[PDB]
Amino acid sequence: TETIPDVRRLRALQAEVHEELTENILKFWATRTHDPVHGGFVGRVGPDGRPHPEAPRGAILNARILWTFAAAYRQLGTPLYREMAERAYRYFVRHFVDAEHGGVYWMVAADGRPLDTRKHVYAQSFAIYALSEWHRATGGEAALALARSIYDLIETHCADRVHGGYVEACDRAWRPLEDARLSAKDAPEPRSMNTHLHVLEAYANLYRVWPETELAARLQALIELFLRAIYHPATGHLILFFDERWRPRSRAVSFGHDIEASWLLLEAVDVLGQATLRPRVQQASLHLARATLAEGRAPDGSLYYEIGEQGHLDTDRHWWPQAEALVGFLNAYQESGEVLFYEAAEDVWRYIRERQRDTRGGEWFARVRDDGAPYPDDKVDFWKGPYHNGRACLEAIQRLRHLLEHVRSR
Ligand SMILES: OC[C@H]1O[C@@H](O[C@H]2[C@H](O)[C@H](O)[C@H](O)O[C@@H]2CO)[C@H](O)[C@@H](O)[C@@H]1O
Ligand SMILES: [Cl-]
């Protein structure tokens, strides 16, 4: 017997999500971030809302801008979104794409000159994800060919064929780095859940527009790696860092990554159409969602940030785990039929509106303290694009559309 929120409630939530996406998030990005000096988009916007057109620009950020406007154009049709995606795409191919060695640089100066030429797999993945989405939105052939080329370079220079998975960073000419850390925050270990989750994400979107046989095998191997080595059935959490043989080298827990993975793993297995693997993926997915429900939430329904290596709970609410919880909890409801997950989705949405959203300055606060106080962090930077929250809104709109259809037409 189906337990489903009534039509008024589903439609009201869907409407609020659409309003937030179009009138806050995408409006902010389309108006505040374009740079008419160097083209493209600024690399940073400060806490006061001031853009910085001369700040260094990251590949991940720019791929995220491309992905978000491409996906929004595809789903909503608004011409402004195609215009913004095109703007992101042209700068991306001009400056981030290495025309000689292939793949994308980590960071360029505002004028486009390469600043940090490392080829990090996390950044290569976002390039694939964004380029494939731009192809899905516009049918561009160069974009798809480029996404394919980057896939090839990852497999050639990074795949670990003894152990499964990938070396996570190389230099410009694809010679492996000893230091594959994304940032000073990350453990200096050779394998991370974080990078591998985004490889999976990218490969799934690529497979959508280019269903190559070998890609299906690599995508399947990635799903299997998650089930065997990364997801921990005793705890319902993803292990964060490993050695090359996937021996755990971390005890931290990241609620945001758990709940993001909960829906991304199912998206990937469904893009493949891998019916044999689905039940086990579904089981892991629901477990991740339940563990997040039980351990990662404040009494207001928002998500805490992490439990660190020494056990400390970081109670800060970062913007992106809230976004991922919206999608992951709605997904858990769709999978299980258990309305407690819808209730959790509603609770995090109310938190997003009442605390995470920056009503004064536009967009969403990067971080809000446990007492409700916003931190004066940058509004846009290397690590904060429009992708987590933009995607979360697009996903919720579509998932709610499907739930609304459970009232059969007569
Ligand atoms: O640890 C590296 C940086 O991660 C950033 O958080 C990421 C997160 O790791 C995950 O990949 C998610 O999908 O995107 C998040 C936002 O960019 C974090 O904000 C940075 O502080 C870290 O340096
Ligand atoms: Cl983002």
Swiss-Prot record:
Optimum pH is 6.3. Optimum temperature is 80 degrees Celsius. It is an enzyme of class 5 (isomerase). One of its GO terms (biological process) is carbohydrate metabolic process. Its EC number is 5.1.3.11. Keywords: Isomerase. The keyword Transmembrane helix does not apply. Pfam families: GlcNAc_2-epim. Disulfide bonds: none annotated. InterPro entries: 6-hairpin_glycosidase_sf, 6hp_glycosidase-like_sf, AGE/CE, Cellobiose_2_epim. GO terms for molecular function: cellobiose epimerase activity. It catalyses: D-cellobiose = beta-D-glucosyl-(1->4)-D-mannopyranose. Belongs to the cellobiose 2-epimerase family. Catalyzes the reversible epimerization of cellobiose to 4-O-beta-D-glucopyranosyl-D-mannose (Glc-Man). Can also use lactose, epilactose, mannobiose and cellotriose. Highly specific for oligosaccharides linked by the beta-1,4-glycosidic linkage. Shows preference for lactose. This is Cellobiose 2-epimerase.
